Design a protein around this nucleic acid. Sequence first.
DNA 1: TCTGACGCGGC
DNA 2: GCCGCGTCAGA
Lengths: 202, 102, 53, 49, 49, 470, 330, 201
Amino acid sequence: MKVTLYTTKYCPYSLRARIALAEKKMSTDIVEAGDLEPAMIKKITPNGVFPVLMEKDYSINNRKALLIYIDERFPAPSLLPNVVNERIKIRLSLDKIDNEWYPVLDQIRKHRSDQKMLESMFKDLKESLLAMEKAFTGSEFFISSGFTLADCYIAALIICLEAEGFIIDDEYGAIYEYKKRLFARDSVKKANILLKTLRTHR
Amino acid sequence: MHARSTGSYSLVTQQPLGGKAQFGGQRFGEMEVWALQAYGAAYTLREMLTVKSDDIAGRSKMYKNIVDGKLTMNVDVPESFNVLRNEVRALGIDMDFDYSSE
Amino acid sequence: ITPKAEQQLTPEERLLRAIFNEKASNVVDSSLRMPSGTSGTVINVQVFENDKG
Amino acid sequence: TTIKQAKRMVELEEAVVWDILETVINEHPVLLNRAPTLHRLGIQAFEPR
Amino acid sequence: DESIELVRILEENDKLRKQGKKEVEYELVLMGITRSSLSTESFLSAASF
Amino acid sequence: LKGKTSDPIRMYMREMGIVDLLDKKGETDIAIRIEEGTTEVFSTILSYPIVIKTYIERFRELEEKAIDYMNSENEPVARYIRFNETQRAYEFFTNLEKMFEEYQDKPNKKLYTKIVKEFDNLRLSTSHLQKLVDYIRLPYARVKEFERKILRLCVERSKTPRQEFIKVYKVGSLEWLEPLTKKYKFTENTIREIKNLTKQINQFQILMMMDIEELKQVNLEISRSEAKITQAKKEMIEANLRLVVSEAKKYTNRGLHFLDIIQEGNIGLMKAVDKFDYRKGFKFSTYATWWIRQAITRSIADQARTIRVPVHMIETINKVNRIKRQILQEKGREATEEEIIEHTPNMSKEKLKKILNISHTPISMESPIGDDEDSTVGDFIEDKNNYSPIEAANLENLREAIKELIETGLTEREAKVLMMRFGIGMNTDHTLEEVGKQFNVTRERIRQIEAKALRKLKHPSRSAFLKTFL
Amino acid sequence: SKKFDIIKISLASPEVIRSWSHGEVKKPETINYRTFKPERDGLFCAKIFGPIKDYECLCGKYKRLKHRGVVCERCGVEVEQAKVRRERMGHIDLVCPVVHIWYLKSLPSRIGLFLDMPLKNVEKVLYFESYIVTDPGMTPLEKKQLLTDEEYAEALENYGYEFEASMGAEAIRDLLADTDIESEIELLQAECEESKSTAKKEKAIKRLRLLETFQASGNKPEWMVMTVLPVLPPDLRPLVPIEGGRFATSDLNDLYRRVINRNNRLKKLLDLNAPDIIVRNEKRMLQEAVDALLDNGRRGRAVTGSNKRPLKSLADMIKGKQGRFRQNLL
Amino acid sequence: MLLYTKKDDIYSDIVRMILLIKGANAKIVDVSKEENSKHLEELNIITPNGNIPTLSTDDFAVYRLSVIIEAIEDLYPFPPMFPVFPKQRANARILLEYVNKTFLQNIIKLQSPDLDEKQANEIKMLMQRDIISTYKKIVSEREVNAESNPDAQNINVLTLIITFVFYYFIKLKISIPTKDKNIIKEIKELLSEPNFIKTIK
DNA sequence: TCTGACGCGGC
DNA sequence: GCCGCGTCAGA
Ligand SMILES: Nc1nc2c(ncn2[C@@H]2O[C@H](COP(=O)(O)OP(=O)(O)O)[C@@H](OP(=O)(O)OP(=O)(O)O)[C@H]2O)c(=O)[nH]1
Ligand SMILES: [Mg+2]
Ligand SMILES: [Zn+2]
């Protein structure tokens, strides 16, 4: 029936959840955590998790299994591959991104206060992207014949990095083949902002 | 004669029909409850009210036990009381079960 | 006989149908029968046909 | 061996059923009540034969 | 008007809780049987009658 | 008077009847006043240049829809925006676009006057003018929403000053935040969001014109003109309030109470009054009457029965009932269904047989049956969607018996295959391919194994016992 | 210990009602005439209350053991046992807040004691017969003052703004909300301190007890006027068909259908900016419909069906010898 | 269909028990044993950190205990360790993740030979304190899952993981602070299960 | 019918 | 401070 999701601005997992909901094509209510009263915001979660989602009888505050739960709850086109081997490989790839991505975003966001330190991180990140350049080529969204949840995970990183003033398309190495295609999907193109502007904002 | 063992139940109250029109069955009078209280046979009074009339879980379990012949009793709650709480719940007044440590 | 649909037979029932090759009826029977403890003979029978047919 | 088989045999009022009923009701109490239960004495328990 | 059971327990609570504390002074009153039943502490019992 | 009378209808009628009836001359004067107010509002709205560009853009969207139509002798016809104002419309739009471009590039007064005169020649009644007002109103409303969001984010965080409203109120400079860095409200994420919102506001101003004050005065003038038109309309409506009661008298027992029928009549009258024009010489009562009658009939059909029935279906049933009433009195015979189909516009025979089937309203369960053993219909209804305990018990014996049989037969492989293919206690009811993968071999052998198990279980010693259930 | 040893009864806040309701009903549609199936947003609508069949979606596209907790995208109906429909509850939004009939007509009415004013004057304000000043302003008129319409116009002309005299349920709710218990109780006790209860003081005793009880409970005083009303589950009010091709319909269903349509008409009138007199009539009719639904005939002649028998209110079912407490419980 | 295992590893023992329940063809290989140094080197080439236990298949190679268990469940239609209902499955997954992070990491740290006395004592105390809460939560989840489906004949992975944790606690010699006879009897019954005995011996 | 309780409006 | 009119609520 009615489902609502609570999200925090500039959160990669929150963007991933929004993209998954858009792919599922299930109508939902989106509420910013900041607008809610601070005592009320604390009441929903004592620990305080910005991205949880809202249900009448159940609430999930775990991002690690949240995407899997969202996929299982809805029988709409799946974000996971039908083939068992591809499905197993995709989970390992998701674990690889989740296990060691703290340095890519968290360290640059807070640890690199110095402008040179941000610059030092940027050169290493560019070299890592070039190393990733010698990888999957011509894949529609990744190592699968159909759109996958892992493709949704990449979108959150691409928007977050762009917000970090690190935009690479032809300077990001030979990963340009799928980067333009990913924006093509309607759900993915919801990252940021005479009749057309008003209609789009509505 | 109006002999009845198992009969269909009223849709609104999940309770047995009466008068022998379909399967009939004998209603239990409130005064009979007073006589049972005077006797002090609480076990008879508690079983008749829940499993015998509106306990949907109890009636099926009781029938299975009688066919099995093993001895077990389940009387978690009466459905009529839950229906009454729902009727009160529709009104502004709220009724719910609670645990008191005071 | 009155027809029924969406039987949704459970898996044990499905296995029983498969073992005996027993088909599931799409219709049910609701014949008129005298109540138990009642015995009699049929003195008269009345039937009314459809109209415009 | 089955609940349905037992119901079908019971429907035909087989002779063996009566003896089983007599054994089951040999020591089983029953309650007799009247429409006006003015006092507890009105409801009483007797052994059915 | 207050219940005798409530007065005795309240008198007992202040009876030795600190000192005497003038726990209470009361005079008995007479009420009708229906009035007594409606005055019962339990709302459910009063509501059903 | 204020007698404490509980009934609402008596209280409402006393207020409604107070207004005196108005002669035709008064109605004509009120219509002229409303017309002059509407003309003034349109003249104020067309004055701003951006409205013309927005109109051209909307026509361009219609042109793109027309191009889409061709892909699926005449240009696609879409005239929703302009009514009774398509070749002439298209030619006028082309002239308007070229003239608007010329006016923006060079002309200051003459081209604007020419465009205003061409718009006056164009004829629109209520919807198009409302759309133009929303076009001016929508941008200001969006800017106000952005300002409210910025105030909420910064006011509570920036020391909660509240009283020092003017300094925060300066808007679009986006330079107070740097001074505020020395002060409270040190929210870098909040600061970035506020800068983004102000950037959006600057872009909106660039598209529309200069600062908020430019549009605020226009909105105030539009509001004053609309208030004058509303006052004139209310003055006309109050005198005609009794019309709904007069029309409502004919239907008082159609299954709808008098108060709701009166409300439906009022709703019909209010919509009808705005459309009517005084240019033609006629009483407004007939124009109001048609709308009131349509509203009352529609309301009765929509809420006539507890179960919703289609209005078109209801009207055909009403026509059939009238024909039956005429035939029964004229020829006495109650049905004559073949004769009824003999002279009808329905042109169907199956429809009449199905049409009269829903002729019975649902009965009330609590309704009494006289004495009838002092019993009521509601108590008799019984639950038929829930399995009875005897129905519940037999299923349990059958399910328990099957598991014992599977153990009594194959040592383990046959039982496992039977459970996986049929699925007992198995969530997915796995297919043959999954079972074959589970062994890693015998991918097609699984079907043969299942067949052998079925043949073994089909023997009389196990088959006879399970036969009773089926 | 897994056992509830105590039972408590408390007033329900709007937030609590929203939490109880699984769905919101916007249009009063019970069943499709051609096919006996749930309406999309009807009181019998399957999406909010639940699936008619066990583990079967209304479309029936999802009908297998593989998906049990899955929700079909095509339809709002969830896959679950049909028993959930009985315990499932729904809520209806109200454009204008409606005062509870039970508290107003308590005899003694709680609202009248709280406002310390006659019941007749409160009823006159509710019907819109009189205007009450919500905000005192710098003007001499007392906050608890009833002003005639000509008197109200004269006061507005002499003082203009700075005072508010709203009428109907909203004004009463605002007056209840703007009340300080601590200030009122201390002054009321001070009147109690000068004890002269031979006649006048005897009435004041009840008010102090009521204020103390409200303070102990912590329940908001304004909660008595309901901004939203919950809807009873469909199984409690069945529309199941019967022999003769007819469907038995509960009295409550008719009242619910009338209230929803009246609320929709009121919202449409507010959207159209229609004349104030018509809006007042719609507000009064909605209030009367709510009163009839909770208990018909309490302050007025009871509404009746085609049979002409008075309709059965929810309060009527729980009370009387045929009432639920003594009829089915015992 | 080859699983790399290291003796004295809790995760490897749990994976072996899961395979034994499947009764599939598992070619257990010991990285520690010098008998198969070349195979261990091949495992190092395939896996960058050489994480154990590692399940190896011709189509793909996987690492991480949770991923390996999910892959085994997809590969085999044998009785499942997961609930039919999605909300129940999500709750079970969250419980497994919490138990693994709170206790499995502490067990791995205690496994190292360079442990300090203070750290070991604190870890043991925390494990004893949370053991009762974890067991109670697992029992409640098992009862709720059982209520939805009767006679499902489905074994719960979380109960098996709790039994393995208790067995490791006994092997470490750590003391369990439970004064309840019922809890001790239930733990003994879980330890007495026949399928569990085959891996333990 | 009625009883009362509770009222609460006149003076 | 009171007469006398009234609601309700059960039979
Ligand atoms: N030896 C061994 N350890 C395991 C295995 N599975 C999980 N772990 C460890 O347990 C900890 C919990 O891992 P997860 O729950 O899967 O991931 P999480 O940290 O996001 O919760 C991790 O520590 P961590 O420091 O977070 O690991 P990392 O992800 O930072 O490398 C991980 O290294 C296994 O099969 N063998
Ligand atoms: Mg980690
Ligand atoms: Zn469906």
